[PDB]
Design a protein around this ligand. Structure first.
Ligand SMILES: *[C@@H]1O[C@H](CO)[C@@H](O[C@@H]2O[C@H](CO)[C@@H](O)[C@H](O)[C@H]2NC(C)=O)[C@H](O)[C@H]1NC(C)=O
Ligand SMILES: *[C@@H]1O[C@H](CO)[C@@H](O[C@@H]2O[C@H](CO)[C@@H](O)[C@H](O)[C@H]2NC(C)=O)[C@H](O)[C@H]1NC(C)=O
Ligand SMILES: *[C@@H]1O[C@H](CO)[C@@H](O)[C@H](O)[C@H]1NC(C)=O
Lengths: 56, 49
């Protein structure tokens, strides 16, 4: 829910009706297919919330 | 508020319970069905009053 935006250096997801920028993660995004199909897709890291736990 | 048209159409698909990726994975087909459907309007109105 919401949309991807950039301040010119970083990419955030944010809700459609009130700017509240959030880190892009596997929790706030869903996957479908590879890069090749989509018009205007861009490259960024998507954070994984499990990795601090796998550090234990 | 400006927004790209293929992003407006993803919000519009998301409003009928169809997941956004359906648009982006089919944007060529959806654009051609739309442009073709607009073409039939002129043929219909030109064919009969
Ligand atoms: C885009 O947003 C990011 C995050 O708010 C900005 O990067 C931060 O900038 C402050 C102040 O320069 C630093 O203290 C932080 O350490 C930065 N964080 C990161 C992750 O780099 C970034 O400056 C913003 N871009 C612009 C053009 O304003
Ligand atoms: C997104 O990043 C990938 C790599 O992470 C880029 O893929 C490379 O693109 C060049 C030019 O097409 C190829 O020579 C490389 O072989 C590609 N590498 C891989 C691993 O596929 C991709 O071009 C980037 N996309 C954008 C829009 O910047
Ligand atoms: C966006 O439009 C510019 C021309 O203004 C074009 O060069 C660019 O390739 C376009 N990108 C996408 C994702 O359509």
């Amino acid at each position: 829910e919401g949309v991807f935006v950039s301040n010119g250096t970083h990419w955030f997801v944010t809700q459609r009706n009130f700017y509240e920028p959030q880190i892009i993660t596997t929790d706030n995004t869903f996957v479908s297919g590879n890069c090749d199909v989509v018009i205007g897709i861009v490259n960024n890291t998507v954070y994984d919330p499990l990795q601090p736990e796998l550090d234990s | 508020l400006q927004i790209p048209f293929a992003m407006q159409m993803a919000y519009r698909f998301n409003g009928i319970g169809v997941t956004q990726n359906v648009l982006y994975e089919n944007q060529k087909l959806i654009a051609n069905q739309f442009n073709s459907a607009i073409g039939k309007i002129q043929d219909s109105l030109s064919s009969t009053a």
